[PDB]
Amino acid sequence: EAGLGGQIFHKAVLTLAGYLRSRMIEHGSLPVTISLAFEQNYVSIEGDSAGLAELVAALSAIGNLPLRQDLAVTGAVDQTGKVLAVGAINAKVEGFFRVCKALGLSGTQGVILPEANLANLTLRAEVLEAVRA
Amino acid sequence: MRLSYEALEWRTPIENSTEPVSLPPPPPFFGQERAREALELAIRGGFHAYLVGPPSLGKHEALLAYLSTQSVETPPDLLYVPLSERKVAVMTLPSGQEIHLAEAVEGLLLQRFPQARAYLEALRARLARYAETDPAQWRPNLLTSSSSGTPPPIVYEPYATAPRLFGRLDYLVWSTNVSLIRPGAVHRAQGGYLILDALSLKREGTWEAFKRALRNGQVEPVTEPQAPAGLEVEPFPIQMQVMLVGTPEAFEGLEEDPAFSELFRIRAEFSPTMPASPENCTALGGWLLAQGFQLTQGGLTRLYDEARRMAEQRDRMDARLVEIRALAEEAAVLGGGLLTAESVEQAIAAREHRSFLSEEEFLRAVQEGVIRLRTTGRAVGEVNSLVVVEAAPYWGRPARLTARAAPGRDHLISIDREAGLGGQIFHKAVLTLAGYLRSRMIEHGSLPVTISLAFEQNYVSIEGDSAGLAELVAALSAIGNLPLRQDLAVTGAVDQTGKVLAVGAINAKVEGFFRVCKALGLSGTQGVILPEANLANLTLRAEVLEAVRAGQFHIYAVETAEQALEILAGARMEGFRGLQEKIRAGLEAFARLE
Amino acid sequence: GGWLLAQGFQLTQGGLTRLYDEARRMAEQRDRMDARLVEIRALAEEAAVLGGGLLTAESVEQAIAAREHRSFLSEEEFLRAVQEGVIRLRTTGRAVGEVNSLVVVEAAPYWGRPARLTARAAPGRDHLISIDR
Amino acid sequence: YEPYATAPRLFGRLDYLVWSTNVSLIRPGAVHRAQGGYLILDALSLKREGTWEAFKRALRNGQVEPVTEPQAPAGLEVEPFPIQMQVMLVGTPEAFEGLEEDPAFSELFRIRAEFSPTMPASPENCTAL
Ligand SMILES: *C(=O)[C@]1([C@@H](O)C(C)C)NC(=O)[C@H](C)[C@@H]1O
Ligand SMILES: *C(=O)[C@]1([C@@H](O)C(C)C)NC(=O)[C@H](C)[C@@H]1O
């Protein structure tokens, strides 16, 4: 709405609305307004790769469900709620490790990502060591 | 209706594959009767004409062969004569007579030629004046001479620059005189034909000056900035027919000038296809032998049948002889000099291999699950819609299309169109489908549902109405909770009345869903549903026709969107027992939920 | 007629009459004739070739026909696609909410064609929707 | 391999002695030097230098004109000649996009040789590397 999101990002939001509307039908129309923001983002963002994170945040806000902040999330979602492949998977993973590392590893941090990207994980040594530990 | 193998087979039976063909060279316009008749008029009447049609049809070759058969009386000698030390004119004298004047002239250091009066006088008054009181720039300058008019002069100048059209002045150091003028294509074409490309006239910026030559007779040799003075060149009467050549789109810019159609009154338009008949198969064979190919019957037959598939029509063949020849030239290498059925079929395969990287990446990502598709089982509100990705050579692929329905107030939402990925024609198809849906399901008042449709994992712009039938079946499936076959992909446009309409790239679509089914393992029950109105455009490749013959792939042709839904949902619209009932019950559940 | 004889044409009465009546049709008016003498002459020049030097009614009517043939490719493609059912049209029978509306396609010489126009009506709140618009 | 596809580098150059000019002062370009063999050019240089149309003309029509000067009172006519060479053009998918909307490109360059951005990670490609 503020003009920071591209066409593919917009598409991902409409897909997510399609999923949400169609899962929760018992009341008629969804009796809620849901707003989603990337806090402190000041630049244009494009891609559907934040869809799964927007969807979990939306179901959490509806259901009053506390979510783990030690697990970052990445993945695109289709209207049926299936998680889809995203690009730059190794960068994403490693960049959440760097932040967790810079603030002190707690032991329970990690990332949730699409099963369809398993074959693109070629993680750097430091992350594979942490996972092994 | 199911399309049997017998219904789909379209290729030409080959007897005695390896026997060498021997056939006479056809006439220059075979299968182009429109153009031939337009150019017969322009030749009989002296009109200028333009030859318009797609690239690679061989317009130029055909026109040069045609004009080479014409005859005209032997053209006159053409020359510049001085009328003064600063004036020149173009003149004609009867053929062979210039060499006689030039000698009469040279034997004037220190009548026979009535035509040369203007120059002869001007010559005397200068002799008078030098008596009355070197520079030897008073002789005629021969531009062309010719020994017959069979064939007439035929000048094709593909590079239409001003010095190439209109000639050039040389300076000796300035000095300049009538003797240093060189002719252009205009001069060389006098008493015959000048052939130019429409795109060169535009690119070189020479259209206006060429107009002036044809309209006003002004043909100025090109000059240099430096030269203290220069020669005046008198206009001259133009005696030539111009033939311009180009594509429909090369002509578009020239056509907004009124002067174009005043000056080029004969349009000779070449058709992109011709009848696929035994007489055009025969002309093609003689045309190939005359190009120097060693052709065999099987090779002529496969080329002929590949021209039909290039036209995407069982009844018509592609008219672009230059393209058939290019393919024949690659076939020849592969058959060692001999154009056989194998070598043609292998040339084709190699071309497909050479532009197959995008498709290999694609099929890999489907195999890895990076693109998520289904080619088996049933699923509600989903269907393999078939698409062609923007880019030559335009492979076809399945795209998973989903539809979700929820209680809401009649809204048919295309996500790709709302996100700006869908073009105007695609948008039109969605509104058509909403028009159909609203008007079929009226019992509750307004449609008590919101329906959203997305092409999953599409990241590019999509245009065309060719996904309409797949969007419509997905929408009725989501309303009615109807499981659809994922082993049948769908293609077709739909109108407001629910009739299925023709779509483009039908062979690509079909074959690209076969490739995906093949790459994931054929299950035996995969296939495509497509418009009955495209039957005549199915000229499927061998591997698909074989699979269909083996019962391992299936083509269904439909006339209405309801027939597609019955196939994909495995049940009739009526009975009880029937799809219409389940869609009713669906809509009523939504209506209550509202 | 006098203007044509002064240009050097060998004109006959039937030839002058058809030229005159083709100038009326070029104006698309029964009462007015097209004033473009250069255009009448160009047509007369093609007629002359076809009548062997003599401008007759046949040769004028045949010049006209040949010009229509020479720009008829688009229409031949069109009529073929209707005949094959690739363009779907009806020219017989009755149908609800459909009609052959007639159109001119952008491009010289501007042939006319039927276009099937459909209208669907449903319960809703006064909306007249032109899909093409 | 002429990476710098300017007209004088492709088609050769006329020298003038002071003008005078004659057949003896003509220098060859890459086109001449490539006769009976192979000429390699980059798609991006053809575009940047503006020499695509003139190179078309060389391949299509056999016109290979040495480059000339404005000043020169006159100049030499150069007859076309039959071209005997194979051209190999090199570039990215995006260097080709502009050349591909000309019909003449795919008429003249009938063999596309597309390099894949990745290959199999196998012990034989580890060994070749
Ligand atoms: C995902 O599509 C993506 C995310 O950064 C944004 C927040 C959607 N967009 C991108 O360009 C990069 C590569 C991410 O994948
Ligand atoms: C159909 O009109 C079509 C489909 O790819 C999209 C999904 C509508 N569009 C096209 O350009 C190609 C050629 C398909 O026909």
CA nearest B498: which of B472, B478, B475? Answer: B472
Contact (CB, 8 A) for A36 and A58? yes
Own/partner pairs, A107-110, CB within 8 angstroms, 24+ separation: A108/A70, A109/A70, A109/A71, A110/A70, A110/A71
Mutation to test the D interface, candidates B161, B224, B356, most D Cβ within 10 Å: B224
- In sequence order, what E strands does B348-395 have? 378-380, 382-388
Contact (CB, 8 A) for B415 and A48? no
Going from the Cα of B429 to the center of ligand 2, the distance in angstroms, rounded, reads: 11
Is B228 in the A-facing interface, judged by CB distances under 8 Å? no
CA distance B269 to B32: 8
Start-to-end CA distance of chain B, whole Å, equals 39
Phi, psi angle pair for B296, to nearest 5°: -115, 165
Q: In the 8-state DSSP scheme, what is residue B20?
A: B
Q: Is A66 exposed, middle or buried (0-12, 13-18, 19+ CB in 10 A)?
A: exposed
User: How many Cα atoms sit within 13 Å of A48 on the Cβ side?
Assistant: 25
CA distance B565 to B484: 8
CA distance B324 to B319: 9
Phi, psi angle pair for B98, to nearest 5°: -70, -35
Contact (CB, 8 A) for B307 and B282? no
Asked whether A45 lines ligand 1 (CB < 6 A), one says yes
Contact (CB, 8 A) for B352 and B309? no
Query: Within a 10 A sphere around the Cβ of B473, how many other Cβ atoms?
Result: 28
User: Which residue type is seen at B154?
Assistant: I
Structure determination method? X-ray
How many Cβ pairs closer than 8 A exist between chain B and C?
82
User: Which residue type is seen at B95?
Assistant: S
- Secondary structure, 3-state, chain C: CHHHHHCCCEECHHHHHHHHHHHHHHCCCCCCCCCCHHHHHHHHHHHHHHCCCEECHHHHHHHHHHHHHHCCHHHHHHHHHHHCCCCCCCCCCCCCCEEEEEEECCCCCCCEEEEEEECCCCCCCCCCCCCCC
Mutation to test the B interface, candidates D64, D78, D112, D115, most B Cβ within 10 Å: D112
Is residue B163 reached through a cis peptide bond, with omega within 30 degrees of 0 on the bond before it?
no
| Rg from Cα positions in chain C | 22
Backbone region of residue C91 per phi and psi (left: phi > 0; alpha: psi in -120 to 50; beta: other values): alpha
Q: In the 8-state DSSP scheme, what is residue B110?
A: -
Find the closest chain A residue to B366 by CA distance.
A116
Task: Specify the ligand 2 atom closest to the Cα of B394.
Answer: 13
Contact (CB, 8 A) for A49 and A76? yes
The set of residues, in sequence order, having a beta carbon less than 8 Å from that of D36 and lying 6+ positions away, is: D84, D85
Own/partner pairs, A35-43, CB within 8 angstroms, 24+ separation: A41/A4, A43/A4
Q: In the 8-state DSSP scheme, what is residue B560?
A: B
Q: What are the tokens at D41?
A: 């050019």
Q: What are the tokens at B429?
A: 């198809």
What angle, 0 to 180 degrees and rounded to 10, lies between the N-to-C axes of helices B321-334 and B278-290?
A: 60
What DSSP element (H or E) covers B128?
helix B117-131
β-pairing verdict for A71-73 and A110-112: parallel
**DSSP per position, B408-426:** SSSEEEEHHHHTT-B-HHH
- Secondary structure, 3-state, chain D: CCCCCCHHHHHCEECCECCECCHHHEECCHHHHCCCEEEEEEHHHHHHCCCHHHHHHHHHHCCCCCECCCCCCCCCCCCCCCCCEEEEEECCHHHHHHHHCCHHHHHHCCCCCCCCCCCCCCHHHHHHC
CB contact under 8 Å between D114 and B354, yes or no, is yes
Contact (CB, 8 A) for B528 and B490? yes
CA distance B207 to B198: 9
Contact (CB, 8 A) for B538 and B385? no
CB contact under 8 Å between B421 and A7, yes or no, is yes
B277-354 with B355-594: one CATH topology? Answer: no
CA distance B523 to B546: 15
Q: What are the tokens at C45?
A: 């020049």
Contact (CB, 8 A) for B457 and B372? yes
Find the closest chain A residue to B400 by CA distance.
A78
User: How many Cα atoms sit within 13 Å of B544 on the Cβ side?
Assistant: 26
- Secondary structure, 3-state, B516-547: HHHHCCCCCCCEEEEEHHHHHHCCCCHHHHHH
- Secondary structure, 3-state, B52-68: ECCCCCCHHHHHHHHHC
The residues of B that are catalytic are: 466, 509
Q: How many residues does chain D have?
A: 129
CA distance C49 to C23: 20
Asked whether A36 lines ligand 1 (CB < 6 A), one says no
Query: Within a 10 A sphere around the Cβ of B148, how many other Cβ atoms?
Result: 12
CA distance B194 to B189: 5
Q: Is C110 exposed, middle or buried (0-12, 13-18, 19+ CB in 10 A)?
A: exposed
Which ligand approaches the C-alpha of residue A72 most closely?
1
Q: What are the tokens at D22?
A: 């004659």
Phi, psi angle pair for B253, to nearest 5°: -65, -40
CA distance C7 to C47: 14
Identify the residue whose C-alpha is closest to ligand 1 atom 10. A47
CA nearest B253: which of B205, B218, B217? Answer: B205
β-pairing verdict for C10-11 and B554-558: unpaired
CATH no. of B277-354? 1.10.8.60
Identify the sign of the CA torsion B208, B210, B216, B222: positive
* Contact call for A and C: 3+ CB–CB distances under 8 Å: no
The set of residues, in sequence order, having a beta carbon less than 8 Å from that of B526 and lying 6+ positions away, is: B375, B376, B487, B488, B513, B514, B517, B552, B553, B554
Contact (CB, 8 A) for B305 and B264? no
CA distance B84 to B230: 12
Q: What are the tokens at B427?
A: 């948008």
* Contact call for A and B: 3+ CB–CB distances under 8 Å: yes
Is B48 in the C-facing interface, judged by CB distances under 8 Å? no
CATH topology of domain B355-594: Ribosomal Protein S5; domain 2 (3.30.230)
Phi, psi angle pair for B245, to nearest 5°: -125, 135
Start-to-end CA distance of chain C, whole Å, equals 49
Going from the Cα of A90 to the center of ligand 1, the distance in angstroms, rounded, reads: 13
**Residue D39's beta-bridge partner residues?**
D87
Going from the Cα of B463 to the center of ligand 2, the distance in angstroms, rounded, reads: 6
Contact (CB, 8 A) for B558 and B532? yes
Contact (CB, 8 A) for B126 and B138? yes
Q: Which CATH number fits domain C1-70: 3.40.228.10, 1.10.8.60, 3.40.640.10, 1.10.760.10?
A: 1.10.8.60
Q: In the 8-state DSSP scheme, what is residue A26?
A: T
Q: Is C88 exposed, middle or buried (0-12, 13-18, 19+ CB in 10 A)?
A: middle
Asked whether A49 lines ligand 1 (CB < 6 A), one says yes
Q: Hunting for tokens 């002429």 — which residue is that?
A: D2
Identify the sign of the CA torsion B280, B286, B287, B289: positive
Contact (CB, 8 A) for B9 and B286? no
User: Which residue type is seen at B350?
Assistant: A
Going from the Cα of B421 to the center of ligand 2, the distance in angstroms, rounded, reads: 13
What DSSP element (H or E) covers B352?
helix B341-354
CA distance B172 to B174: 6
CB contact under 8 Å between B406 and A78, yes or no, is no
Q: How far is CA B270 from CA B31, B273, B443, in A?
A: 9, 9, 55
Q: How far is D3 from chain B (nearest CA, A)?
A: 25
CA nearest B3: which of B569, B537, B574, B578? Answer: B537
Which ranges in B158-206 belong to alpha helices (H)? 162-166, 185-188, 198-203
Which ranges in A24-132 belong to alpha helices (H)? 51-63, 89-102, 125-132
The set of residues, in sequence order, having a beta carbon less than 8 Å from that of B495 and lying 6+ positions away, is: B432, B436, B501, C88, C116, C118
Q: How far is CA D11 from CA A57, B191, D1, D29, in A?
A: 66, 35, 14, 4
Query: Within a 10 A sphere around the Cβ of A56, how many other Cβ atoms?
Result: 16
Query: Within a 10 A sphere around the Cβ of B205, how many other Cβ atoms?
Result: 11
Which residues form the pocket of ligand 2, taking CB atoms under 6 Å from any ligand atom? B 387-388, 426, 462-467, 503-505
Q: Is B383 exposed, middle or buried (0-12, 13-18, 19+ CB in 10 A)?
A: buried
| Rg from Cα positions in chain D | 19
CA distance A122 to B187: 72
* Resolution stated for this PDB structure, in Å: 2.0
Contact (CB, 8 A) for B56 and B320? yes
Going from the Cα of B530 to the center of ligand 2, the distance in angstroms, rounded, reads: 13
Q: How far is C34 from chain B (nearest CA, A)?
A: 16
Name the residue ranges covered by the structural domains of chain B.
2-276, 277-354, 355-594
